[PDB]
Nucleic acid binder design. Structure first.
Ligand SMILES: [Mg+2]
Ligand SMILES: [Mg+2]
Ligand SMILES: [Mg+2]
Ligand SMILES: [Mg+2]
Ligand SMILES: [Mg+2]
Ligand SMILES: [Mg+2]
Ligand SMILES: [Mg+2]
Ligand SMILES: [Mg+2]
Ligand SMILES: [Mg+2]
Ligand SMILES: [Mg+2]
Ligand SMILES: [Mg+2]
Ligand SMILES: [Mg+2]
Ligand SMILES: [Mg+2]
Lengths: 149, 95, 213, 131
RNA sequence: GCGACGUCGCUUUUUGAUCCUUCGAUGUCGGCUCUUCCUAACCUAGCGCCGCAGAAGACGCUAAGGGUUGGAUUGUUCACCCACUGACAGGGAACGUGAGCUGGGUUUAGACCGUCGUGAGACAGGUUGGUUUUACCCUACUUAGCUGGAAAUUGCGAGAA
RNA sequence: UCGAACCACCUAGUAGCUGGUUCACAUCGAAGUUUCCCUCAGGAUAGCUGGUGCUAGUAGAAGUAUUGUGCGGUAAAGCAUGAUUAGAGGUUGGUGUUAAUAUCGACCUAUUCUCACUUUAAAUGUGCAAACAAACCUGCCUUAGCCUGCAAGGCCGGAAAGAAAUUAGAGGCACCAAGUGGGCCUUCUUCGGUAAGCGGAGCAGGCGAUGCGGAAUGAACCGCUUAGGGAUAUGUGGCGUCAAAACUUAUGGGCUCAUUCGAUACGUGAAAAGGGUGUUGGUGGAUAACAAAUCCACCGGCCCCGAAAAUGGAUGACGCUUAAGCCCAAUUAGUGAUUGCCCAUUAUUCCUUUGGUAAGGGCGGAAACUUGGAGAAAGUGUAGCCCUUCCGAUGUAGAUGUGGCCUGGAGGUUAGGACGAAGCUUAUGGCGUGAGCCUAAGAUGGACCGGCCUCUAGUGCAGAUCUUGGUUGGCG
């Protein structure tokens, strides 16, 4: 237990990736965050001022606080028998706007717009077709298999 | 593993008569007589006629069951030969 | 008898230790003269280039391949010539070795060292073989192939562990079969580089325009 | 009475979202069951075709009927694995009635003398011999 | 016959570890005494084999059956010589063996010395002097009796070398 | 009695240490870890656990997947930071040479050999989100932002549905309190060590705390996990005798002879190369002659030697060898499609208990041929209010409950006793799962005392080198 500093065992974790170093994006500076959206707290180095502790690196969570240049993010931390909603304070560059809901952001956007189209809408344009069923399949090349040595 | 190769035969001329009784061999002649035992695996000695042919068939076979057949062939001919011809043994010394 | 007969390192119970900024007092291995024989030798000389690839994850020390560098060598003159053979060794003792020498005299007896201050210091070097390691490759004629079923077995029995001869269908330092190789010289597909040579591959460049100007 | 019936297992590779009509692969395997036939159907395609049992579907496995029960010769090109000389093939011409019968003797001979058992054993060319 | 180089199996009367058993006690080495066991054979015993003519050695294998000493110095184990001998082989048995002996070495409390320490004292350094209890119990063994006993004390239960 | 006497007293000195700590059943039931400690034989604090709960809780559920969506740099890989280096020969030093020459280093090259450093490079992971306000169509207000309206916050009503699987074995807190804080083994991988039945770790499982079944034998392995019984059927393991089962299978395919064969995993590993002129298998390549067939080389064991000890000696024993060994298969015999067969604290089913406060239904008078109950009381708890229904049932430390057991005594009540009380004896039964109670019969006893509701405590003993008394063995 000789060393347990705030940045311990983190050579490869905060190290920038191969052939992508230097200053942060202009997207990451032109992001727009509110109190409530989700963010991937992907601590990048090359800013080295506002990086969170190692633990909060693959972690995503609500933004409970947006200061001028520091996003405050709550993150669930399974301590021992309970999770703490930790309240980390990082700068914006250590933050992505988390996709994690486009799975149903973009689903119910067109899913309702066609459920409405299917319930009332204007008309019901036919959609994606069935996937798994039978069929009298016609082959196009026969083959066999014994060995290759 | 196991196979069959051939059959072994010996002819029994005049002056020599061979039996088959208790699967044993009796050979006599006009110079001497001798009888002995030749049992082995798959080696059942049966003489067809009294003076026709000494036959020893085996039905199974491998290196060991077949390296034991024609030794009775090596040990039946000298029964028929010793009772008519005989083999003398000589001994010498030096000083 | 005073040094552990290279058996207590037949298994990779430990990491690899490289000669590096970590170890600084590493001694010298006695295997140095890897190549023997005809030296500037060209490539079209010998038809057969047989390998010698191991079988298990054994671990041979610096002391058995060093004689294979000589044992598997010397039997040339007794049944062949040196200049009719390529003796090139294709390994090196990289894994530097520690040693713990217990029972010091500075202190008490049988209670001085109760397992502390008792880690390693340099003694020598050995190797890690895994399944598929070439010990000592061979190049030869046709009338000189069955030579070192002895010389190898002379040194295969100097080794800890066993070994085999690997009859090959390659043209040595190239990736070409023998049967088609006599056909490739008929159309000059392969070039030369000294004691070895390089293959003109597909995707050929406009550079080597070898035709008359 | 001889176990290890002869199965005719055939199958595509779940067509396809990429190729939309992958070539069909059929081969005949001796197996106790058909679950064991499909288990060794999806071992050939996983190896000889790089197709998973997941990303493909079995079209129609089938039990070959028989040959008129009568003795005849059989040379069975068989390939087993073992720490006993890894991956050696063999010929071992047997004389049994049906292909199911002779290949049975093939397995009970290798497991007898090489201790190579069912999953360490591939089979090829279960054909007959006139003379 | 082994020796370069080497390596590879199996070795404890081995050098140490390990800390598993023992801290309401498995009593310390060596001997004495006595019994056993193993062979990796020291002797005798059996052929074998050589540049084994006799002589006489030479290499080897088979055999644990029998045999393997008396002393001087040492507490010793070991070692060393002395001398006999056919030769004086190597081991286990809780480094066989103290409710068997011994008490020489370890061995404390006395004392002296050397070095150490300011000192009390320390030394696995030397020297000298220094307890050795109990079987009358169970089994083991050793001899010494007695008495039951065959459905091994019972059924009538029935089997005759 | 003396490296500080002896007596009495403080004093029942203190002890993180050792030993002991007295009834039953029921309901649950762990921990050897975190941090802090002159702390590492102990504490405190969390976790684990019990009890009491509170509360609107198919949800703020999940040791699980799916779907999207992030994350990572270990395995494998590959050799730029490094290598490691010699093999082919040719700028920079010294030098052996006759401006001509090398010579080894540095270098120069095509490389090379095999490693830690390299790369979004795995598997396994893990972070998130996923349907009634997460999208809309709207409208508030202070407007904070920015020059009316956007966007923003706290809001909001009109309206919104799903054409992320499963379990959906109910969510949420709260309180009080123990015990534990010496773990060990193991799988997977892996740090240190010559090694280990070694030390230190990660993961999960176990044991501890736990039997049962069988691997002869074993805390841990393999099955299975545990209320009392019966049956049916299996698991692991087996079916020659011991030993239930092939009364030695109608067994089938080969293998195997072994002068210590071989034979159940993990026990610890059994045997390592090496060869042969050996028994069985396979591939390369001749002759049509070996001394009508016979070869030159190897792959593969079963098997032969290599190889060895000390009480007598172990597959577990016998024994087996045209197996009862080994490897494959079988399962009523190529006749026609199933379970050959034997063993459990497992499974199924059947009764019986008991808990759940688990659901129900009655919770005061009627009939099915003979009795019982859909008439036994509004009830936590029993000799249950009555039925019947589901489910669970092991357990050390610990916790808790009991209309629960027992001893001494008190307040009440009911009641015995010279026609024999307490006590005491037990082949005296019965009845309660049990603690225990009641009875009988005493060729016992002689004068006190039982049940029930409360109260009360000097209240239960096998074990403390317990204390006291008595006896006993050894023992004539
Ligand atoms: Mg002694
Ligand atoms: Mg004397
Ligand atoms: Mg006695
Ligand atoms: Mg790697
Ligand atoms: Mg998870
Ligand atoms: Mg168990
Ligand atoms: Mg066993
Ligand atoms: Mg039954
Ligand atoms: Mg058989
Ligand atoms: Mg009292
Ligand atoms: Mg008391
Ligand atoms: Mg008492
Ligand atoms: Mg007592």
């Amino acid at each position: 237990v000789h060393s347990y500093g705030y940045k311990s065992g983190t050579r490869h974790l905060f190290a920038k990736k191969f052939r992508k170093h230097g200053a942060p994006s202009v997207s990451t500076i032109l992001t727009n965050i509110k109190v409530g959206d989700y963010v991937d707290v992907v601590a990048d180095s090359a800013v080295r001022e506002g990086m969170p502790h190692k633990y909060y690196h693959g972690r995503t969570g609500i933004v409970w606080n947006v200061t001028p240049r520091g996003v405050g993010v709550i993150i669930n931390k399974p301590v021992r028998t309970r999770t703490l909603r930790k309240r980390i304070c990082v700068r914006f560059e250590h933050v992505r706007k988390s996709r994690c809901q486009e799975a149903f952001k973009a689903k119910e956007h067109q899913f309702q717009a066609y459920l409405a189209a299917k319930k009332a809408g204007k008309a019901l344009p036919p959609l994606k077709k069935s996937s798994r069923m039978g069929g009298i399949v016609r082959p196009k090349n026969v083959e066999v298999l014994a060995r290759r040595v | 593993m196991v196979k069959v190769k051939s059959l072994c035969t010996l002819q029994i001329p005049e002056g020599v008569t061979v039996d088959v009784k208790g699967r044993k061999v009796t050979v006599t002649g006009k110079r001497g007589t001798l009888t002995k035992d030749l049992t082995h695996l798959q080696l059942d000695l049966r003489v067809d006629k009294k003076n026709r042919t000494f036959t020893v068939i085996r039905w199974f076979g491998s290196k060991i069951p077949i390296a034991c057949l024609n030794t009775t062939k090596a040990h039946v001919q000298n029964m028929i030969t010793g009772v008519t011809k005989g083999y003398r043994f000589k001994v010498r010394c030096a000083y | 008898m005073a040094r552990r007969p290279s058996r207590c390192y037949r298994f990779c119970k430990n990491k690899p230790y490289p000669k590096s900024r970590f170890c600084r007092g590493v001694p010298d291995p006695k295997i140095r003269n890897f190549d023997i024989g005809r030296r500037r030798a060209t490539v079209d000389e010998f038809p057969v280039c047989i390998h010698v690839v191991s079988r298990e994850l054994e671990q041979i020390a610096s002391e058995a391949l060093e004689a294979a560098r000589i044992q598997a060598n010397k039997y040339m003159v007794k049944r062949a010539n040196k200049d009719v053979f390529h003796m090139r060794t294709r390994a090196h003792p990289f894994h530097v070795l520690r040693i713990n020498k217990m029972l010091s005299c500075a202190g008490a007896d049988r209670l001085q060292t109760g397992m502390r201050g008792a880690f390693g210091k340099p003694n020598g070097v050995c190797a890690r073989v895994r399944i598929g390691q070439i010990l000592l490759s061979m190049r030869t004629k046709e009338a000189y192939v069955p030579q070192a079923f002895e010389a190898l077995r002379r040194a295969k029995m100097k080794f800890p562990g066993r070994q085999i001869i690997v009859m090959s269908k390659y043209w040595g330092f190239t990736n070409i079969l023998r049967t088609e190789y006599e056909a490739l010289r008929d159309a000059g597909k392969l070039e030369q580089r000294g004691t070895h040579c390089k293959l003109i591959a597909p995707k050929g460049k406009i550079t080597m325009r070898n035709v008359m100007a | 009475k001889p176990h290890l019936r002869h199965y005719q297992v055939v199958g595509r590779e779940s067509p396809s979202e990429k190729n939309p009509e992958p070539t069909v692969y059929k081969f005949e395997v001796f197996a106790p069951n058909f679950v064991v036939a499909k288990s060794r159907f999806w071992r050939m395609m996983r190896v000889k075709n790089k197709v998973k049992a997941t990303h493909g579907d079995v079209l129609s496995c089938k039990v070959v009927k028989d040959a008129k029960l009568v003795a005849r010769n059989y040379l069975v090109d068989i390939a087993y694995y073992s720490q006993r000389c890894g991956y050696t093939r063999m010929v071992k011409e047997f004389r049994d009635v049906s292909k199911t019968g002779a290949v049975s003797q093939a397995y009970h001979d290798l497991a007898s003398r090489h201790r190579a058992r069912y999953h360490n054993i591939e089979v090829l060319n279960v054909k007959s011999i006139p003379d």
